């Protein structure tokens, strides 16, 4: 007859050994995945534009 | 479901398997029962009715 | 098309796509015949997978051009011949149960 | 492109966009003018032609 | 003014007493009608503010594209306006130019917010209830209908606790509890 | 506070709709930027289009972690609450203790006469990033749900091959230090969703020379998770297994909290479908 | 054990069959279309 589900995988010695080999390889490479912290002239006429636009921004704010 | 097999040993031979209804809805046979001898529990994709008939195709 | 004539004799060589699942399809109605004027193989429809069950192998068919009118959903663009006669008798007569296939 | 600024930046970007759209678009919808009344636009044209 | 005849119309193609061209579509009075505001000066104060935001957006546009200053200041502007409530999408800087409008500011005004939260049934009703002094924002009541309530204060508009509106609301739901003298 | 949660969830949904409507405008801006950089003719539609060409200055100034975790990913160390189903068996209480030990910044709640609205509301008000609810079948554990709280997502997993720590031997007790993680074979988009939720279930910024690594390995849509303490010798790394080990299959992923039950389903394991036993991650 | 085996070999048979049918369709299409388009370009010359 036919089955509608791959049944659950039994855990075996070789399955455990493959997982242990993958873990050994990743530790030897020191390659993990982990949650890391999020931290934290120009020109004459460019300075002139920056000055006028910061003054105008301050007034609008 | 109640009338396909005779024993829980039989249903355990056939469990996890794929049944449908006359009405078209699919489902699987999931586990044998204990107090009656050939009864089992099956999960379907919609609410089966009482008037219907489940079937298992076999070769 | 194949040179001079309107119809071309040919030998059925193999039966393409017999192993397909869904009945009455393009790859199921296609066969492959070799024209005897050139010794040159080319693929060609038959109508009606029943008539596919008629034509068999090394059997002296006679092809004609196909002539589609508008494009269809599942037809194969490129096959350009259909089978008209099989070993002297016509596939429509064999299909409508008028005649028999002689060998 | 980094150090260009102001109206020169505005007009050069508009010129490039006009060039590409002109190569692959319909001529009227690409270059419609702006609305100006009749005697105004005729006076501008005659001044410029002179 | 009399539906003048054909030759009169051809000689006076350009007269109109009701609609001139400086009354720019009568957009001001039309928006005052839509959101029920009390004075002409209010529409044109909002228009002066929108003009200032738009000239700042134009100058930041005229700065070069890959400028850290340009990206920083246009982001500050979009963040500020979204937090205030005027524009609804924090992502588009052509919205920062295009979709900043007097109607956006005029519908962060207070009776529009009440009417949208369904405290009132029309915007005229909301203005009436504010004027009669039923509405409080936070712990202190608001008497000005022209109050610009941001998002994080739209989380705090309520009924003043001793109002006949609140009594009727609870009493309809059959939940009055006069220990509070609600 | 509940009024703030309501208005902020509404605003997030509306922003979601608008972003999914202007992905096309994002693609059109990409086409215009490509043509400007290496000048080819534009297509017909963008050539005739005038609003988009006119507004490609601001949108030329214009320019990844998930949406629900982006604000406070590496900022707040998350606190979770490992709580039992209801009326727990003692072996399932043991397993809940195991999970509390496995995660750092976890606390443990015996559930008795607690309802789910009161539970979720109190967790929101006190401020807890996650809830982890465990379910048994006569001592054996079989299900685990994780909810991220400020109107976040809930993942429901079924866990199968459970072998406890107290089951093995009196080997001592855990190391409890902020661990390293390993995520193997998580490849598709749903793999990114699950690796995102589990990674943010853990803690942020571990050291360079910790001693314990916690591994989630995807083997054919079964996630297997283990704990290993490691010592680096002169030639090769030796590792000692610790913690429970179990295969854990995800079977749904709702988008409200676990009290909602009319949340917008993101995914669901289809069993009685014709091609169920072919595809992985389906 | 038997269920896992049967499902694995059934999926292998299905994938092989799909690859084979696509192969046959593509060879027919390219070869017969090349011959047909060359003959049609020659007939339009007439």
Curated annotation (Swiss-Prot), chain A:
Source domain of life: Eukaryota
Localisation: Nucleus, Nucleolus
Record text on subunit structure and interactions: Component of a heterotrimeric complex containing IMP3, IMP4 and MPP10. Interacts with snoRNA U3. Component of the ribosomal small subunit (SSU) processome composed of at least 40 protein subunits and snoRNA U3. Interacts with the SSU processome subunits EMG1, IMP3, IMP4, KRR1, NOC4/UTP19, NOP1, RPS4A, RPS4B, RPS6A, RPS6B, RPS7A, RPS7B, RPS9A, RPS9B, RPS14A, RPS14B, UTP1-UTP18, UTP20-UTP22 and UTP25.
Similarity section: Belongs to the MPP10 family.
Primary role: Involved in nucleolar processing of pre-18S ribosomal RNA. Required for the early cleavages at sites A0, A1 and A2 during 18S ribosomal pre-RNA processing.
Name under which the protein is recorded: U3 small nucleolar RNA-associated protein MPP10
Curated annotation (Swiss-Prot), chain C:
Localisation: Cytoplasm
GO aspect biological process, one term: regulation of translational fidelity
Record PTM: Hydroxylation at Pro-23 affects translation termination efficiency. The stereochemistry of the 3,4-dihydroxyproline has not yet been determined.
Effect of substituting residue 24 to A: Lethal mutation
Annotated signal sequence range: none
Domain of life: Eukaryota
Keywords (A to Z) from UniProt: Cytoplasm, Hydroxylation, Isopeptide bond, Ribonucleoprotein, Ribosomal protein, Ubl conjugation
Transmembrane segments: none
Annotated crosslink Glycyl lysine isopeptide (Lys-Gly) (interchain with G-Cter in ubiquitin) location: 15
Alphabetized GO MF terms: structural constituent of ribosome
Keyword Transferase: no
Main location: cytoplasm
Quaternary structure, from the entry: Component of the small ribosomal subunit (SSU). Mature yeast ribosomes consist of a small (40S) and a large (60S) subunit. The 40S small subunit contains 1 molecule of ribosomal RNA (18S rRNA) and 33 different proteins (encoded by 57 genes). The large 60S subunit contains 3 rRNA molecules (25S, 5.8S and 5S rRNA) and 46 different proteins (encoded by 81 genes).
Further comment found in the protein's record: Present with 10600 molecules/cell in log phase SD medium.
UniProt record similarity statement: Belongs to the universal ribosomal protein uS12 family.
The protein, known as: Small ribosomal subunit protein uS12A
Organism: Saccharomyces cerevisiae (strain ATCC 204508 / S288c)
Swiss-Prot record, chain D:
Disulfide bonding pattern of the chain: none
UniProt subcellular location: Nucleus, Nucleolus
Coiled coil segments of this chain: none
Function of the protein: Required for pre-rRNA processing and 40S ribosomal subunit assembly. Seems to act in the processing of 35S rRNA at the A(0), A(1), and A(2) cleavage sites.
Quaternary data: Interacts with KRR1.
Protein name per UniProt: Protein FAF1
Interval of the full protein contained in this chain: 199 to 248 of 346
From Swiss-Prot, chain G:
Localization per record: Nucleus, Nucleolus
Comp. bias regions, Basic and acidic residues: 33-46
Region Disordered, annotated ranges: 28-46
Lineage top rank: taxon: Eukaryota
Stated role: Involved in nucleolar processing of pre-18S ribosomal RNA. Has a role in the nuclear export of 40S pre-ribosomal subunit to the cytoplasm.
Subunit structure: Interacts with snoRNA U3. Interacts with EMG1, MPP10 and NOC4. Component of the ribosomal small subunit (SSU) processome composed of at least 40 protein subunits and snoRNA U3.
Family: Belongs to the NOP14 family.
Protein name: Nucleolar complex protein 14
Organism: Saccharomyces cerevisiae (strain ATCC 204508 / S288c)
Name of the gene: NOP14
Residues of the full protein shown: 761 to 806 of 810
């Amino acid at each position: 007859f036919d089955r509608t589900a791959k049944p659950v995988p039994v855990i075996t010695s070789e399955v455990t050994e493959s997982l242990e080999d993958m873990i050994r390889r990743r530790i030897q490479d020191s390659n993990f995945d982990d949650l890391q912290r999020r931290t934290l002239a120009l020109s004459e006429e460019l300075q002139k534009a920056h000055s006028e636009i910061s003054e105008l921004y301050a007034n609008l704010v | 479901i109640k009338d396909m097999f005779s024993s829980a040993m039989e249903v355990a031979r056939f469990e996890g398997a794929q049944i449908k209804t006359v009405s078209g809805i699919r489902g699987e046979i999931k586990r044998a029962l204990s107090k009656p001898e050939g009864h089992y529990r099956a999960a379907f994709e919609d609410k089966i009715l009482m008037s219907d008939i489940v079937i298992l195709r076999s070769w | 098309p194949f040179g001079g004539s309107s119809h071309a004799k040919g030998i059925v060589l193999e039966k393409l796509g017999i192993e397909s699942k869904q009945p009455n399809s393009a790859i199921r109605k296609c066969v492959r015949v070799q024209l005897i004027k050139n010794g040159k193989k080319v693929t060609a429809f038959v109508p009606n997978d029943g008539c596919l069950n008629f034509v068999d192998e090394n059997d002296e068919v006679l092809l004609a051009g196909f002539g589609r009118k508008g494009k269809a959903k599942g037809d194969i663009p490129g096959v350009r011949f259909k089978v008209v006669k099989v070993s002297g008798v016509s596939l429509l007569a064999l299909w409508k149960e008028k005649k028999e296939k002689p060998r | 492109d980094d150090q260009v600024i102001g109206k020169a930046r505005s007009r050069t970007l508009e010129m490039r966009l006009n060039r590409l759209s002109r190569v692959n678009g319909h001529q009227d919808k690409i270059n419609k003018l702006e609305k100006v009344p009749m005697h105004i636009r005729r006076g501008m044209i005659d001044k410029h032609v002179k | 003014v009399r539906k003048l005849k054909h030759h009169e119309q051809k000689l006076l193609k350009k007269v109109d007493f009701l609609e001139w061209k400086q009354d720019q579509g009568h957009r001001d009075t039309q928006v005052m009608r839509t959101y029920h505001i009390q004075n002409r000066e209010d529409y044109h104060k909002y228009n002066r503010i929108c003009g200032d935001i738009r000239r700042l957006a134009n100058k930041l546009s005229l700065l070069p594209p890959t400028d850290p200053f340009r990206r920083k200041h246009e982001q500050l502007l979009l963040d500020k306006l979204y937090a205030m409530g005027v524009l609804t999408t924090k992502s588009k800087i052509s919205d920062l130019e295009n979709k900043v409008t007097v109607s956006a500011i005029c519908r962060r005004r207070l009776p529009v917010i009440m009417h949208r939260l369904k405290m009132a049934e029309t915007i005229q009703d909301a203005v009436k209830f504010i004027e009669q002094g039923h509405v409080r924002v936070g712990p202190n009541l608001i008497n000005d209908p022209a109050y610009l309530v941001t998002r994080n204060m739209e989380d705090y508009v309520t009924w003043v606790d001793n109002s006949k509106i609140k009594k009727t609301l609870l009493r309809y739901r059959n939940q009055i509890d006069d220990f509070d003298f609600s | 506070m509940l009024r703030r949660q309501a208005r902020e969830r509404r605003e997030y949904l509306y922003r979601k709709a608008q972003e999914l409507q202007d992905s096309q405008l994002q693609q059109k801006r990409q086409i215009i930027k490509q043509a400007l950089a290496q000048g080819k003719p534009l297509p017909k539609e963008l050539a005739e289009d005038e609003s988009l060409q006119k507004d490609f200055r601001y949108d030329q100034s214009l320019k990844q972690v998930d949406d629900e975790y982006a604000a406070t990913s590496g900022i707040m160390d998350p606190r979770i609450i490992v709580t039992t189903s209801r009326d727990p068996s003692t072996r399932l209480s043991q397993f809940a203790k195991e999970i509390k030990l496995l995660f750092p910044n976890a606390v443990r709640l015996n559930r008795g006469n607690y309802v789910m609205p009161n539970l979720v509301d109190a967790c929101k008000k006190s401020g807890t990033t996650d809830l982890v609810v465990l379910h048994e079948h006569r001592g054996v554990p079989t299900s685990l749900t994780i909810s991220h709280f400020p109107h976040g997502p809930t993942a429901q997993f079924s866990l199968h091959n459970v072998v406890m720590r107290h089951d093995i031997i009196n080997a001592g007790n855990q190391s409890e230090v902020n661990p390293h993680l390993i995520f193997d074979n998580f490849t598709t988009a749903l793999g990114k969703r699950v690796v995102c939720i589990l990674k943010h279930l853990f803690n942020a910024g571990p050291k360079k020379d910790s001693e314990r690594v916690i591994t989630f390995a995807n083997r054919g849509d079964f996630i297997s998770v283990r704990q290993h303490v490691y010592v680096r010798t002169r030639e090769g790394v030796e590792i000692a297994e610790v913690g429970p080990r179990f295969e854990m299959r995800l079977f749904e992923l709702r988008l409200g909290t676990l009290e909602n039950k009319d949340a917008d389903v993101e995914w669901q394991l289809r069993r009685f479908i014709r091609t169920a036993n072919k595809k992985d991650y389906l | 054990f038997e269920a896992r085996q049967r499902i694995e070999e059934k999926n292998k048979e299905s994938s092989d069959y799909h690859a084979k049918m696509a192969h046959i369709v593509n060879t027919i299409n390219t070869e017969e279309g090349a011959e047909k388009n060359k003959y049609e370009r020659e007939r339009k010359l007439r």
